Amino acid sequence: ASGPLPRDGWLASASDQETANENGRAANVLDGDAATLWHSRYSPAPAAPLPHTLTIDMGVVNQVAGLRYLPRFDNMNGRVGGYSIHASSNGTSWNLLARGTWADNADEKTVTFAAASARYIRLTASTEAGNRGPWSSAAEINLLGTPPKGPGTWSPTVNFPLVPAAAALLPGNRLLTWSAYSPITFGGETGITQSAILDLNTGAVSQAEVANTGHDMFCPGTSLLPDGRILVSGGSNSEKTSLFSPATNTWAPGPDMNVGRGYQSNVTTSTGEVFTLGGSWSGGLGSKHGEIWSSTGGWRPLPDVPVDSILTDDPGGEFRSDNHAWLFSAAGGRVFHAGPSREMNWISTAGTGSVTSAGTRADSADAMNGNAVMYDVGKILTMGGAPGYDNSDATARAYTIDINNGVDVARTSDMAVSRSFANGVALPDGQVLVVGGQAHAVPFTDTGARMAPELWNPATEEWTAMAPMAVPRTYHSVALLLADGRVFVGGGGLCGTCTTNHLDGEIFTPPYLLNADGSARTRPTIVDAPATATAGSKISVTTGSKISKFSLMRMSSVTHTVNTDQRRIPLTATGTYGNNTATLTLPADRGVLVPGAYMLFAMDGNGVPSVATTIQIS
Amino acid sequence: SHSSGAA
Ligand SMILES: [Br-]
Ligand SMILES: [Ca+2]
Ligand SMILES: [Cl-]
Numbered sequence: 001a002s003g004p005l006p007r008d009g010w011l012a013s014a015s016d017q018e019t020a021n022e023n024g025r026a027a028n029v030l031d032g033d034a035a036t037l038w039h040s041r042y043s044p045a046p047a048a049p050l051p052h053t054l055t056i057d058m059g060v061v062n063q064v065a066g067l068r069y070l071p072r073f074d075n076m077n078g079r080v081g082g083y084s085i086h087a088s089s090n091g092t093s094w095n096l097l098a099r100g101t102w103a104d105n106a107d108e109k110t111v112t113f114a115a116a117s118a119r120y121i122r123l124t125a126s127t128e129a130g131n132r133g134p135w136s137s138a139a140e141i142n143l144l145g146t147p148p149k150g151p152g153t154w155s156p157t158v159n160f161p162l163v164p165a166a167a168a169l170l171p172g173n174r175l176l177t178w179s180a181y182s183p184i185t186f187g188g189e190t191g192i193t194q195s196a197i198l199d200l201n202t203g204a205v206s207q208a209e210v211a212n213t214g215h216d217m218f219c220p221g222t223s224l225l226p227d228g229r230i231l232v233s234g235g236s237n238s239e240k241t242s243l244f245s246p247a248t249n250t251w252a253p254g255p256d257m258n259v260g261r262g263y264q265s266n267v268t269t270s271t272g273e274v275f276t277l278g279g280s281w282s283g284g285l286g287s288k289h290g291e292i293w294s295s296t297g298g299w300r301p302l303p304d305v306p307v308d309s310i311l312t313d314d315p316g317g318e319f320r321s322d323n324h325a326w327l328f329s330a331a332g333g334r335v336f337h338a339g340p341s342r343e344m345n346w347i348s349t350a351g352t353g354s355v356t357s358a359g360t361r362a363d364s365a366d367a368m369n370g371n372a373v374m375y376d377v378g379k380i381l382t383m384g385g386a387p388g389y390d391n392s393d394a395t396a397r398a399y400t401i402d403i404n405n406g407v408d409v410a411r412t413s414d415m416a417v418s419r420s421f422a423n424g425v426a427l428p429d430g431q432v433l434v435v436g437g438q439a440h441a442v443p444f445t446d447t448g449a450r451m452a453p454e455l456w457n458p459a460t461e462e463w464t465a466m467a468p469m470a471v472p473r474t475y476h477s478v479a480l481l482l483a484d485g486r487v488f489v490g491g492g493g494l495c496g497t498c499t500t501n502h503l504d505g506e507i508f509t510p511p512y513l514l515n516a517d518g519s520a521r522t523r524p525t526i527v528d529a530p531a532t533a534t535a536g537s538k539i540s541v542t543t544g545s546k547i548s549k550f551s552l553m554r555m556s557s558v559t560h561t562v563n564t565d566q567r568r569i570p571l572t573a574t575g576t577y578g579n580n581t582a583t584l585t586l587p588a589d590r591g592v593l594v595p596g597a598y599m600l601f602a603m604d605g606n607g608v609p610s611v612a613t614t615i616q617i618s
Numbered sequence: 619s620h621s622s623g624a625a
Pocket of ligand 2: 028029030031032033034035036037139140
């Protein structure tokens with residue numbers, strides 16, 4: 001006997017289904033409701049003949065050892081008699097697991113069989129149990145078995161007092177999160193934000209209402225400053241700027257932007273300024289041209305950085321098309337715009353600024369709510385997204401972009417599953433994790449959630465599926481790297497009386513931290529490293545064993561799929577005279593080594609990261 | 619399972 005597999009993310013499809021005379025849609029077998037059915041198509045006449053099939057794509061490779069069929073309770077029509085059950089891993093080749101005849105009664109029917117690996121299970125209904133008509137119906141279908149064991153492992157869920165739809169890592173193993181004026185909904189311009197800080201050492205959460213900056217910071221641009229503060233601008237109070245200080249856990253008011261905006265992207269530049277572009281979610285539709293903030297001057301317009309060349313072809317128009325730009329600081333101090341629009345751009349922020357076409361992202365379509373992650377110097381991985389923000393099929397496609405000497409784009413391997421609303425996380429070994437999202441982008445839904453993250457390795461350009469998480473993470477979810485090398489994932493929903501809010505998170509331990517058996521792997525240690533350093537300097541780092549590879553991982557803020565802060569700079573060490581002492585040479589180019597808080601990870605020869613130290617780089 | 623009933 002096996003227990004039911006979780007059904008999060010499953011998608012049902014069928015040979016045929018009724019919609020005209022009743023709601024007989026295939027999806028109805030997955031809703032938990034005994035009163036909603038898949039029904040084979042019978043109208044308009046003529047009715048679709050037997051046999052009929054119902055296919056479930058689980059979105060992951062489970063071990064399947066049985067199937068439970070719950071017939072409708074209201075009449076006998078369409079009870080399945082003769083059945084077959086097939087399994088597939090690739091969706092192309094099918095293996096027969098079971099064949100039989102179910103009795104003509106209302107009992108839930110269970111079929112068991114030897115466990116089989118499968119992503120897809122198909123039920124074929126070959127007869128109607130009482131030969132009453134050419135019909136098949138099913139109220140619910142469950143699949144019995146066990147989820148994959150690894151790679152990687154997930155913590156139990158972590159309680160939050162709000163949906164953490166924005167997050168930022170702080171020094172000292174703490175995570176700042178916030179929602180909006182409410183823990184569970186958004187709306188208006190009421191100048192209040194609910195926040196919650198998770199202490200990753202103890203699990204304690206500290207909740208605070210932030211009213212002193214007159215800013216509801218839902219839907220903002222975010223970035224980390226050189227001095228460690230977090231600058232948040234726009235969103236529900238579209239003109240506002242607020243600054244968080246991790247040393248005192250307080251916010252301070254900043255200066256207003258010139259034009260109000262929301263769902264824009266903000267990026268810290270080589271000079272420690274913050275550039276912003278786009279964002280028609282709030283503050284008015286369109287004309288969300290570039291501006292740049294300095295600590296001494298506040299926000300100033302960039303007259304020669306118009307928004308126009310970043311717009312996608314979103315069917316929703318201006319409200320959506322300037323949202324969530326994939327912006328990166330680049331060598332020499334420009335900003336590179338990698339998407340989501342097909343067209344990419346180089347942006348200068350000096351003087352009045354400039355914009356220059358960088359050509360298209362090869363043959364990519366628009367990829368709104370896709371991810372872009374800087375996993376090495378001048379090296380970006382982009383993946384997922386959909387051409388529309390709303391009601392749009394997502395892609396599995398992924399493209400690399402090398403901006404070291406010009407712009408070189410190449411399609412790389414597809415992910416195993418399409419995603420929109422996922423999050424991308426650079427890991428210190430150079431791999432990039434993608435987590436969450438869903439197959440068909442519809443804000444505030446968990447339908448078609450992608451439950452298994454995938455890890456892309458630049459050395460192979462392949463995606464490997466990770467063990468699945470428990471909670472779906474779609475619109476309004478976040479994920480980011482932690483200083484111990486694990487990954488926080490959380491949020492989703494923020495839709496009030498909706499049923500899809502997730503006031504929680506889960507922590508993923510990636511494969512590089514585990515022994516084969518899932519226990520914690522022994523890791524290298526940093527014994528001594530400087531708390532601060534300046535671009536272009538050499539630093540000396542002491543470890544508990546001989547290490548030659550280190551990774552500087554810039555700390556992150558993230559919301560609405562956007563994380564302009566994270567980036568990996570790998571460095572090779574030169575061994576010196578002491579007890580595992582080594583010298584690292586920091587790049588002088590602050591367009592690459594953007595000033596701010598970094599996690600310094602020692603990487604052993606097995607690819608195992610130390611716990612990072614924090615280094616504030618100027 | 620749950621049920622929303624019939625209308
Ligand atoms: Br609390
Ligand atoms: Ca149902
Ligand atoms: Cl601090």
